[PDB]
Design an enzyme around this catalytic site. Structure first.
Site, PDB file in Angstrom:
ATOM      1  N   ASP A   1      -3.432  -3.073  -2.290  1.00  0.00           N
ATOM      2  CA  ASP A   1      -4.471  -2.039  -2.386  1.00  0.00           C
ATOM      3  C   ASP A   1      -4.282  -1.250  -3.689  1.00  0.00           C
ATOM      4  O   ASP A   1      -3.163  -1.167  -4.213  1.00  0.00           O
ATOM      5  CB  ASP A   1      -4.374  -1.094  -1.176  1.00  0.00           C
ATOM      6  CG  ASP A   1      -5.588  -0.165  -1.039  1.00  0.00           C
ATOM      7  OD1 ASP A   1      -6.715  -0.594  -1.381  1.00  0.00           O
ATOM      8  OD2 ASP A   1      -5.424   1.001  -0.576  1.00  0.00           O
ATOM      9  N   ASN A   2      -5.380  -0.678  -4.204  1.00  0.00           N
ATOM     10  CA  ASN A   2      -5.343   0.297  -5.311  1.00  0.00           C
ATOM     11  C   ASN A   2      -4.887  -0.260  -6.663  1.00  0.00           C
ATOM     12  O   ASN A   2      -4.084   0.366  -7.370  1.00  0.00           O
ATOM     13  CB  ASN A   2      -4.450   1.481  -4.960  1.00  0.00           C
ATOM     14  CG  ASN A   2      -4.717   2.034  -3.593  1.00  0.00           C
ATOM     15  OD1 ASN A   2      -3.823   2.059  -2.753  1.00  0.00           O
ATOM     16  ND2 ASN A   2      -5.940   2.492  -3.357  1.00  0.00           N
TER      17      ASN A   2
ATOM     18  N   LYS B   1       2.568   3.162  -5.951  1.00  0.00           N
ATOM     19  CA  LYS B   1       2.050   2.045  -6.752  1.00  0.00           C
ATOM     20  C   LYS B   1       3.032   1.541  -7.790  1.00  0.00           C
ATOM     21  O   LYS B   1       2.952   0.373  -8.199  1.00  0.00           O
ATOM     22  CB  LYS B   1       0.687   2.344  -7.395  1.00  0.00           C
ATOM     23  CG  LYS B   1      -0.365   2.993  -6.483  1.00  0.00           C
ATOM     24  CD  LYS B   1      -0.461   2.319  -5.138  1.00  0.00           C
ATOM     25  CE  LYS B   1      -0.974   3.272  -4.057  1.00  0.00           C
ATOM     26  NZ  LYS B   1      -0.903   2.668  -2.675  1.00  0.00           N
TER      27      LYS B   1
ATOM     28  N   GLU C   1     -11.346   4.651  -0.460  1.00  0.00           N
ATOM     29  CA  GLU C   1     -11.657   5.035   0.907  1.00  0.00           C
ATOM     30  C   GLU C   1     -12.379   6.395   0.957  1.00  0.00           C
ATOM     31  O   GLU C   1     -11.928   7.387   0.361  1.00  0.00           O
ATOM     32  CB  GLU C   1     -10.390   5.043   1.774  1.00  0.00           C
ATOM     33  CG  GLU C   1      -9.249   5.929   1.237  1.00  0.00           C
ATOM     34  CD  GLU C   1      -8.262   5.185   0.326  1.00  0.00           C
ATOM     35  OE1 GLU C   1      -8.575   4.105  -0.220  1.00  0.00           O
ATOM     36  OE2 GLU C   1      -7.147   5.687   0.161  1.00  0.00           O
TER      37      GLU C   1
ATOM     38  N   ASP D   1       0.826  -1.211   0.000  1.00  0.00           N
ATOM     39  CA  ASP D   1       0.000   0.000   0.000  1.00  0.00           C
ATOM     40  C   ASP D   1       0.869   1.274   0.000  1.00  0.00           C
ATOM     41  O   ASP D   1       0.479   2.322   0.539  1.00  0.00           O
ATOM     42  CB  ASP D   1      -0.976  -0.042   1.185  1.00  0.00           C
ATOM     43  CG  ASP D   1      -2.080   1.014   1.096  1.00  0.00           C
ATOM     44  OD1 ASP D   1      -2.342   1.540  -0.004  1.00  0.00           O
ATOM     45  OD2 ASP D   1      -2.695   1.331   2.138  1.00  0.00           O
TER      46      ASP D   1
HETATM   47  C1  LIG Z   1      -1.476   4.845   1.264  1.00  0.00           C
HETATM   48  S1  LIG Z   1      -0.297   5.432   2.492  1.00  0.00           S
HETATM   49  C2  LIG Z   1      -0.206   3.997   3.587  1.00  0.00           C
HETATM   50  C3  LIG Z   1      -1.585   3.747   4.185  1.00  0.00           C
HETATM   51  C4  LIG Z   1      -1.677   2.613   5.186  1.00  0.00           C
HETATM   52  N1  LIG Z   1      -1.334   1.305   4.553  1.00  0.00           N
HETATM   53  C5  LIG Z   1      -3.076   2.635   5.799  1.00  0.00           C
HETATM   54  O1  LIG Z   1      -4.028   2.049   5.284  1.00  0.00           O
HETATM   55  O2  LIG Z   1      -3.273   3.255   6.847  1.00  0.00           O
HETATM   56  C6  LIG Z   1       1.262   5.433   1.503  1.00  0.00           C
HETATM   57  C7  LIG Z   1       2.540   5.511   2.342  1.00  0.00           C
HETATM   58  O3  LIG Z   1       3.608   4.780   1.774  1.00  0.00           O
HETATM   59  C8  LIG Z   1       4.827   5.423   2.079  1.00  0.00           C
HETATM   60  N2  LIG Z   1       5.848   4.951   1.137  1.00  0.00           N
HETATM   61  C9  LIG Z   1       5.910   5.240  -0.198  1.00  0.00           C
HETATM   62  N3  LIG Z   1       6.966   4.604  -0.742  1.00  0.00           N
HETATM   63  C10 LIG Z   1       7.585   3.891   0.233  1.00  0.00           C
HETATM   64  C11 LIG Z   1       8.711   3.062   0.224  1.00  0.00           C
HETATM   65  N4  LIG Z   1       9.408   2.845  -0.896  1.00  0.00           N
HETATM   66  N5  LIG Z   1       9.096   2.455   1.394  1.00  0.00           N
HETATM   67  C12 LIG Z   1       8.382   2.668   2.552  1.00  0.00           C
HETATM   68  N6  LIG Z   1       7.280   3.488   2.557  1.00  0.00           N
HETATM   69  C13 LIG Z   1       6.888   4.100   1.420  1.00  0.00           C
HETATM   70  C14 LIG Z   1       4.469   6.891   1.934  1.00  0.00           C
HETATM   71  O4  LIG Z   1       5.363   7.715   2.647  1.00  0.00           O
HETATM   72  C15 LIG Z   1       3.079   6.915   2.547  1.00  0.00           C
HETATM   73  O5  LIG Z   1       3.202   7.079   3.937  1.00  0.00           O
HETATM   74  O1  LIG Z   2      -2.888   4.339  -1.019  1.00  0.00           O
HETATM   75  C1  LIG Z   2      -3.346   5.198  -1.927  1.00  0.00           C
HETATM   76  C2  LIG Z   2      -4.735   5.166  -2.111  1.00  0.00           C
HETATM   77  O2  LIG Z   2      -5.422   4.296  -1.374  1.00  0.00           O
HETATM   78  C3  LIG Z   2      -5.340   6.003  -3.039  1.00  0.00           C
HETATM   79  N1  LIG Z   2      -4.608   6.868  -3.779  1.00  0.00           N
HETATM   80  C4  LIG Z   2      -5.243   7.646  -4.682  1.00  0.00           C
HETATM   81  C5  LIG Z   2      -4.731   7.764  -5.982  1.00  0.00           C
HETATM   82  C6  LIG Z   2      -5.364   8.543  -6.945  1.00  0.00           C
HETATM   83  C7  LIG Z   2      -6.549   9.229  -6.630  1.00  0.00           C
HETATM   84  C8  LIG Z   2      -7.088   9.109  -5.341  1.00  0.00           C
HETATM   85  C9  LIG Z   2      -8.355   9.838  -5.015  1.00  0.00           C
HETATM   86  C10 LIG Z   2      -9.375   9.902  -5.969  1.00  0.00           C
HETATM   87  C11 LIG Z   2     -10.557  10.592  -5.671  1.00  0.00           C
HETATM   88  C12 LIG Z   2     -10.717  11.213  -4.421  1.00  0.00           C
HETATM   89  C13 LIG Z   2      -9.702  11.135  -3.461  1.00  0.00           C
HETATM   90  C14 LIG Z   2      -8.522  10.447  -3.774  1.00  0.00           C
HETATM   91  C15 LIG Z   2      -6.436   8.319  -4.383  1.00  0.00           C
HETATM   92  C16 LIG Z   2      -3.264   6.894  -3.619  1.00  0.00           C
HETATM   93  C17 LIG Z   2      -2.594   6.086  -2.701  1.00  0.00           C
HETATM   94  B1  LIG Z   2      -1.093   6.105  -2.532  1.00  0.00           B
HETATM   95  O3  LIG Z   2      -0.318   5.268  -1.563  1.00  0.00           O
HETATM   96  O4  LIG Z   2      -0.198   6.950  -3.408  1.00  0.00           O
HETATM   97 MG   LIG Z   3      -4.185   2.698  -0.537  1.00  0.00          MG
END
Ligand SMILES: C[S@@+](CC[C@H](N)C(=O)[O-])C[C@H]1O[C@@H](n2cnc3c(N)ncnc32)[C@H](O)[C@@H]1O
Ligand SMILES: O=c1c(O)cn(-c2cccc(-c3ccccc3)c2)cc1B(O)O
Ligand SMILES: [Mg+2]
Length: 218
Positions: free
Chosen positions: A172-173, A147, A202, A144
């Protein structure tokens, strides 16, 4: 005590400290879900996809889990709350400020003992998991983070000998925004058996999805 409230992440944490029951993981999750539904969107896995993550864990009953991308600690709390005594979650987060919030989130939710938070990039930490973090192989991986990193890290996990027959990868995603290179790899490879779960982004009505890929062995 509270953080300044300067970032969205500090505000999500402050909300939890003020509006949830300490040591109650469910209460913590509801508070984050409520805050992000009403006040400020955040990229937590959320409650609808969270239920899919719950069921995968409940079906396969992992003891050694790896999470890539922690953020505020929402999925760490969600996953750790379901773990057996002696089960371990390792969560990797690149951003030191998020990692700080995640540790506090985890402490407050009462799951501290289940969680090993590692500050750093997944690609630097993954090769260290066996020697530094006393890992044999993984039962389950939750992907997660960024991507475009789903595929290189999946391969790296394989190259480092951390995957075994029966390791569950959950990503995810895979619809929003997508990770098509990862998705082609697991679906196209005889080394993985894949299941797709359609759900919603979400806190939104945008269609999203998770992919489960069970490792067959090399
Ligand atoms: C979608 S959020 C994580 C959400 C979490 N899994 C949740 O549901 O609460 C994306 C996170 O991945 C971290 N991240 C991105 N690339 C990473 C990497 N190469 N190694 C560790 N963390 C990374 C970003 O800093 C950000 O905090
Ligand atoms: O974990 C993620 C996640 O669950 C969703 N998105 C994401 C990507 C593009 C659009 C939207 C989006 C659309 C519509 C409204 C709000 C957000 C959300 C990014 C990350 B990520 O780790 O970079
Ligand atoms: Mg996500």
């Amino acid at each position: 005590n509270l953080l300044a409230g300067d970032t969205k992440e500090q505000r999500i944490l402050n909300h939890v400290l003020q509006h949830a029951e300490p040591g109650n993981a469910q209460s913590v999750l509801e508070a984050i879900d409520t805050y992000c539904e009403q006040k400020e969107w955040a990229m937590n896995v959320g409650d609808k996809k969270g239920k899919i993550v719950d069921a995968v864990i409940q079906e396969h009953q992992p003891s050694v889990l790896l999470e890539l991308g922690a953020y505020c600690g929402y999925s760490a709390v969600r996953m750790a709350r379901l773990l057996s005594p002696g089960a371990r979650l390792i969560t990797i987060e690149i951003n030191p400020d998020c990692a700080a919030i995640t540790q506090r989130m985890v402490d407050f939710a009462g799951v501290k003992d289940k969680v090993t938070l590692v500050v750093g990039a997944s690609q630097d930490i993954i090769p260290q998991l066996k020697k530094k973090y006393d890992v044999d192989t993984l039962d389950m991986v939750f992907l997660d983070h960024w991507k475009d990193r789903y595929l290189p890290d999946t391969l790296l996990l394989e190259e480092c000998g951390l995957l075994r027959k029966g390791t569950v990868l959950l990503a995810d995603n895979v619809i929003c925004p997508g990770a098509p290179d990862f998705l082609a790899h697991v679906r196209g490879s005889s080394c993985f058996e894949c299941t797709h779960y359609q759900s919603f982004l979400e806190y939104r009505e945008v269609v999203d999805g998770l992919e489960k890929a069970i490792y067959k062995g090399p």
